[PDB]
Structure 1
Amino acid sequence: DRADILYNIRQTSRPDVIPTQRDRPVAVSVSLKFINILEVNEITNEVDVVFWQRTTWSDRTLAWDSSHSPDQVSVPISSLWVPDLAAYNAISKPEVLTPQLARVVSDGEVLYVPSIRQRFSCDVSGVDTESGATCRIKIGSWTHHSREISVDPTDSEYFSQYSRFEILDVTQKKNSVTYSCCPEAYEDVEVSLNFRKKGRS
């Protein structure tokens, strides 16, 4: 039953241990679904956004036989390993608006979907034009290079109809960063939010 699955996850899950299988990186899939654009400052080039960060990976150490059991449970993220994802151009801490629970599937797949409100330093020039602003948000692992975490990406279906802004396009492009000190490459997703003020002349 659910209590047994959660008891077993709590005994075997190592929240502090990246679940690398053999020498393979953990494949972290990351998509933003934009829900709202709250505050835009064309002078300071800062945006306040709310997005669903759809995050999935496989931790095969969590797997169980579900032929005669539930094949999914909700688990507090404090009981699981979670990727140390960070937005490189964030200027506030991510504010998680929703309960900090992941779904764990019996094959060991983990789904985490926090609703995040966060402020970014990005190109706001053009927000009050027809072609709009393009704000680029770079999200990757802060401490795990490409041999440990790989980042995989997967338009306004969930965007508030009541925002003063409308979304023209969202592009999600794989990319990587390297710091001259070390040979290590860190994978990121570059998310390009092309948006503008509604109801211009």
Structure 2
Amino acid sequence: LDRADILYNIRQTSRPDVIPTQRDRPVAVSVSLKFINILEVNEITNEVDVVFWQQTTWSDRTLAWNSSHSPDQVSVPISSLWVPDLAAYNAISKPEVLTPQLARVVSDGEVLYMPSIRQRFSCDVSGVDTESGATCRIKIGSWTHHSREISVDPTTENSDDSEYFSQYSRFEILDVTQKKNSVTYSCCPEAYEDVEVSLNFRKKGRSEIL
């Protein structure tokens, strides 16, 4: 098989609307935000404008192929793949996707989708201009799939938090932590999972001694 064959097969047979549940177990989705920039902050309105890579990971066996004498990976338009219906609960704007909408697919069916996104959130901005900084909590989970269909988990807890964060922001990141939750909503009997990402950041210029 060559890349053309693999992509043909995927385009023809992937079922983008079909969640790749295996043996009635939930699709395990890993989610992780890599913060790139903090553009605007409003301590009056408690709103923040942020850029981050939404590193998203899951397995879809229907995409798999025999790679013994073939490419190990391909890039695939997400329009040709099932993607988790993740949403930020406290987002107050549509996700502005900054990057080409392609996912990386490995021959065993592992998928990595990691778009860079600019989005505004409603969260706690108080203390942003102090040493202690503010802690903006961002809640992400499947909008319509409950816990027997999608589970969400934070990816690896090890990584430079500012690895990709802009040195030119007026802000700096003090700490990023992630927490998993399972919540019942009044609309529905089922529990839905989410990841809460706590972004601890401050404005540059209040850790001064002199």
TM-score (norm 1): 0.98
Counterpart CA distance in 2 for 1:41 and 1:141 is 28
1:170 to 168, 176, 194: 176
How much has 1:181 moved relative to structure 2?
A: 4.0
Structure 2 counterparts to residues 30-41 of structure 1, below 5 A: 30-41=31-42
CA deviation string 1:90-113 (max 9, x = no partner):
000000000000011000001000
How many angstroms apart in 2 are the aligned matches of 1:129 and 1:62?
A: 49
**Cα distance per residue 1:4-32 (max 9 Å; x no partner):** 00011112100000000111100000000
CA-to-partner distance for each residue in 1:116-138, whole Å, 9 max, x for gaps? 00000000000011101100000
For the residues of structure 1 that align with 2:41 and 2:186, how far apart are their CA atoms?
A: 34
Once residues 175 and 63 of structure 1 are traced to their aligned partners in structure 2, the CA distance between those partners, rounded to angstroms, is: 31
Per the TM alignment, residue 182 of structure 1 is displaced from its structure 2 partner at its CA by 2.7
Give matches, 1:155-194, under 5 Å.
155-194=161-200
Give aligned pairs, total.
200
The alpha-carbon deviation at position 157 of structure 1 amounts to 1.1
Moved more, 69-78 or 171-180: 171-180
Q: Distance in 1 between matches of 2:96 and 2:72?
A: 30
> How far, CA to CA, are the matches of 1:19 and 1:42 in structure 2?
42
Unpaired runs of 5+ residues, structure 2, are 155-160
C-alpha offsets along residues 70-91 of structure 1, whole Å, 9 cap, x if unaligned? 0100000000000000000000
Three-state SS of the structure 2 residue aligned to 1:29 is: strand
Measured against aligned partners, the alpha-carbon deviations of 1:135-190 in whole angstroms (never above 9, x if no partner) come to 0000000000000000010x111110111100000001111221134321110000
Correspondences of 1:1-201 after superposition (within 5 Å)? 1-153=2-154, 155-200=161-206
How big is the shift at 1:51? 0.3
Answer with 174-183 or 158-167: which moved more: 174-183
Q: Distance in 1 between matches of 2:141 and 2:117?
A: 15
| Identical pairs, percent | 99
Structure 1 residue 57, shift from structure 2 partner:
0.3
Distance 1:170 1:97 in 2: 22
CA drift of 1:200 comes to 2.3
**Alpha-carbon separation, structure 2, partners of 1:97 and 1:182:** 34
Instruction: Give me the whole-angstrom Cα distance separating, in 2, the residues matched to 1:78 and 1:146.
Output: 24
